Design a binder for this molecule. Structure first.
Ligand SMILES: O=C(O)c1cc(F)ccc1Nc1cccc(Cl)c1-c1ccccc1
Length: 136
């Protein structure tokens, strides 16, 4: 089994900057106490690929979470803020596009490589948050 373009995401990443994330969590519907505690967190993101299966882990003082998935195939996810969502992740021109649907709501998380960084864009309606990660 050979290399894949998405191996560019593989590695250990740490959060280095965040913008508008509190507003993004508000639009998602995250309650007060969770927003305050989660807004303080500096998560590590650990991405690995094994065959068709991509695994993304998030570790922080707030919560430790993990998702494993195959591109284009819907799965059940319990988010860090305790939402139970249906998720589908696909590869669009080098960008991992992650859509979560729940309670009639929808949010989109994009992960992309920019220079030596992994840039995350969290979009909920008209509210966007940027989370920038660097190699740990
Ligand atoms: O935290 C990131 O950067 C991130 C990146 C992603 F690609 C996808 C999700 C992310 N985090 C969250 C999304 C919604 C709600 C919450 Cl509470 C979190 C969250 C906050 C603090 C610690 C752990 C998780």
């Amino acid at each position: 089994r050979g290399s894949h373009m998405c191996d560019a995401f593989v590695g250990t990443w740490k959060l280095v900057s965040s913008e508008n994330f509190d507003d993004y969590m508000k639009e998602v519907g995250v309650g007060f106490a969770t927003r305050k505690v989660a807004g303080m967190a500096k998560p590590n993101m650990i991405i690995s690929v094994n065959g068709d299966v991509i695994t993304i882990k998030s570790e922080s003082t707030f919560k430790n979470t993990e998702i494993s998935f195959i591109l284009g195939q819907e799965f059940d996810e319990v988010t860090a803020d305790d939402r139970k969502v249906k998720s589908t992740i696909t590869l669009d021109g080098g960008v991992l596009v992650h859509v979560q649907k729940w309670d009639g709501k929808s949010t989109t998380i994009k992960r992309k490589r920019e220079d030596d960084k992994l840039v995350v864009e969290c979009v909920m309606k008209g509210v966007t948050s940027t989370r920038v990660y660097e190699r740990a």
